Amino acid sequence: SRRRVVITGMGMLSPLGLDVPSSWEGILAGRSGIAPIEHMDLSAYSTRFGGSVKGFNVEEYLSAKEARKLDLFIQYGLAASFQAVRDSGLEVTDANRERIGVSMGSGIGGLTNIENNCRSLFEQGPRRISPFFVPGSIINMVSGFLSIHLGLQGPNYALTTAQTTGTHSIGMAARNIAYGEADVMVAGGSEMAACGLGLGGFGAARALSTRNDEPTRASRPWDRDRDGFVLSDGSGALVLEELEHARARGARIYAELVGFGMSGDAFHMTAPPEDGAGAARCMKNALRDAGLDPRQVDYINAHGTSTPAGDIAEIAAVKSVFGEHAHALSMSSTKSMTGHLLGAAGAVEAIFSVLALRDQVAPPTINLDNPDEGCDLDLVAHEAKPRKIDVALSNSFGFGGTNGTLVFRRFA
Amino acid sequence: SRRRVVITGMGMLSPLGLDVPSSWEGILAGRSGIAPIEHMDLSAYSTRFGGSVKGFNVEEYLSAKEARKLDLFIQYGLAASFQAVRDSGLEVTDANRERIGVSMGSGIGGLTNIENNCRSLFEQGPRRISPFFVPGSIINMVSGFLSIHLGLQGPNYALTTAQTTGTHSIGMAARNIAYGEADVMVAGGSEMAACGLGLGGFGAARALSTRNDEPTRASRPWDRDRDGFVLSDGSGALVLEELEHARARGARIYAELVGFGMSGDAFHMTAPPEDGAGAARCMKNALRDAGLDPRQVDYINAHGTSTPAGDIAEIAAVKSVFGEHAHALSMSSTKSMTGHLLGAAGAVEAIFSVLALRDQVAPPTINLDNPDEGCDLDLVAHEAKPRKIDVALSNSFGFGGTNGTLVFRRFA
Ligand SMILES: Cc1cccc(NC(=O)[C@@H]2CCCN2)n1
Ligand SMILES: Cc1cccc(NC(=O)[C@@H]2CCCN2)n1
């Protein structure tokens, strides 16, 4: 048997806001966080826009001196992590510190830092490389710095499963708690790949929307005019907690994490299969994990990246999995507003899935002006939709054919 | 309920050889794989040597056309993964493909690749960044590419926990099998951090031995004249398999994985606590996990990095966990011969640990001419020591205060 896992704290940086409530206000209002990228020369680039975090003050969290040692993705992960722990009310003690762990991930990690240290290496040679270059750039330092700051002595690790990182991180954090290895985990992901290499690398694979004339319309999942994903920055963190632990301290419980699905496509390095067979197995795995029939699902936060092959595979996957229930559930892509936070996508979208449960409302897919061939599900086009939501799925599909699904259920 | 997990397959690239048996012969013979580096000009660097993989032919595994798109750490991960799977005798079929997954990790991932594209970006511009830059460089694509080549549709992920990555990857893949998420996992890690940013970045931190004039004597764990770790390249992969699944197909069983511990130090970003408190908490978690009396431990493959603080913290941790039995067990660092493969270190060392059980021999700590203050355990100085080993333990510690312990025993 297995312990139950609830969500008692959430934290976020996104293109829509510097916390969860501001981000969620944007989501429900159908606001875009997408805009031309500033303080950065993108003249030679085919994409000049994306979702930046606007107005982030790291000194609300760290001294200027400690922040100078850390890549932006690490700053963003720590901000979401500190927010979620504060949100939870959790008190770390000598009696529980060994039962509280961290799994914050990243898809791509310290590109901005690697870029600036490369600049120095090429211009001036090795002796201008920062002594903090390695510990300030590696993906496990959000978990590491968070554990050192709060005295957390539980399981300390980091996933990196490209665009599936946030989903996998929350899921395997839930397993740690369910199977009794910890009572509390801080889990999610952070990303800041709006550097030359992120825009250039994804630009070189022709992965990115090039709609520079209208950045707020670039991200249009399931729309017949979509031309690739919109690159976005930020972080999500959740405080996961064993239910009896949460009840005993009188925690506020947002929702219960009932199911976790993983699967490999084993198909292609970057492209999903057209029938969405991997996403189908993953969702089926996640619903089995939860002991739920596909009929009980009301809301799916899609991966919904706005790429030609990706959006259409997810329609295929959902129809395969949910048969005659496929039209009854609502499925939206919050990436229509946020863009694609890569390794952080699954984290902020888990929070949006939890808040859909609290507020009984399906977030919109904005820009869904002309649903494509086969895209005839309830994609919640243009505007938020109030409705009954007992069960919410969050899907992530990433490079290497790596899939993740989280099943959240209302707790009352 | 919790299932048992055994090792049916191993594979390796190291500075000592291009597979496991050739690497293991080097270990037992006290051979150093450390030499001045030849693949770049390091005259501007304070460290000009490391454990390179020598004479690696990727066309023993992949087409030159797919290899050209992949960072060496991925090529190294795939070579070790392919060896381990072949060594297991397992056949992937439609009947089991969904129960076979992969967790191959890395500390730093495609730093060589990212540096090369960074160079193209800064001298030429973004139009010269490879279209393959992202899928050819990010850490999860060892798991990704292995799944695509072999048709593995089980859990597909990667850990990144710096120098602990290999141990965590193995430990967590065993938990996946233990809890019935998979019947087989290919797990371990791979690293190729010998580029400008790698040797420069660790150099900037003053973490590396600067013994350029005698590279084979540089790695001298617990020796009073140790001056930092030696950077080494390679991969380790194991086939982990549910015991009954292995029995049902008549698999050759190297050993049983009975114990896994993780703890965070919550002490410092890069320095271990002098008293080994985090490593002690970690070994105890793992011995408890294995249902063991600590006196059952015969052999420890120490992290043993040849840093001043790390080496002494490990003695302290072993004395505190094993009390007077700390004087009866044998503990050695194969990093004396391989150097430090960072995220692959836990993977090759798990294999050395399993071969110490197969062959009933404790590998030496070479270069241990003058053991330091308090370093008075059986550290198997100079020469392999034949001896009874029923139970072997492999330790890793990492930046972020992240700890891993694996416990193996002989199986009948
Ligand atoms: C591809 C593209 C470019 C510019 C605008 C739009 N969509 C609209 O303007 C929507 C549809 C009709 C009412 N408003 N789509
Ligand atoms: C793409 C690439 C690879 C290796 C080196 C360089 N550039 C140089 O070596 C410098 C630039 C100014 C004069 N030569 N670029």
Q: Looking at the chains present, what oligomeric state does this protein adopt?
A: homodimer
Percent of residues in helices of chain A: 25-40%
How many discrete structural domains of chain A? Answer: 2
Strand content of chain A: 15-25%
Bound molecules: N-(6-methylpyridin-2-yl)-L-prolinamide
Q: Biggest sheet of chain A: strands side by side, in what order?
A: 5-4-6-7-1-8-14-13-9-10
Biggest β-sheet strands, sense, barrel of chain A: 10 strands, mixed
Structural class, judged by helices and strands of chain A? Answer: alpha/beta
Q: Would you list the SSEs of chain A in sequence order as H and E?
A: EHEEHHEHHEHEHHEHEHEHEHHEEEE
Radius of gyration of chain A: 20 Å
Total count of strands of chain A: 14
Chain pair with largest interface = A-B, 86 and 84 residues
Q: What labels describe this entry?
A:
412 residues, homodimer, 10-stranded mixed sheet, 18% strand, binds N-(6-methylpyridin-2-yl)-L-prolinamide, 2 domains, alpha/beta, two-stranded antiparallel ribbon, EC 2.3.1.179 (chains A, B), globular, fatty acid biosynthesis (chains A, B), 14 strands, 13 helices
What is the element layout, followed by pairings?
The structure is a homodimer of 412-residue chains.
Chain A (H helix, E strand, L loop, with lengths): L4 E9 L6 H10 L4 E3 L12 E3 L12 H5 L3 H17 L11 E6 L5 H14 L16 H10 L5 E2 L7 H14 L5 E8 L4 H9 L10 H4 L15 E9 H6 L6 E10 L12 H14 L8 E3 L6 H15 L7 E3 L2 H4 L6 H15 L1 E2 L22 E2 L4 E8 L3 E8 L3
Parallel strand pairs in A: 4-5, 4-6, 9-10, 9-13
Antiparallel strand pairs in A: 1-7, 1-8, 2-3, 6-7, 8-14, 11-12, 13-14
Helix pairs in contact in A: 3-5, 6-13, 10-11
Bound molecules: N-(6-methylpyridin-2-yl)-L-prolinamide (WN4) (2 copies).
PDB class: transferase
Keywords: SGC - Diamond I04-1 fragment screening, PanDDA, XChemExplorer, FabF, beta-ketoacyl-acyl-carrier-protein synthase II, transferase
Assembly: dimeric
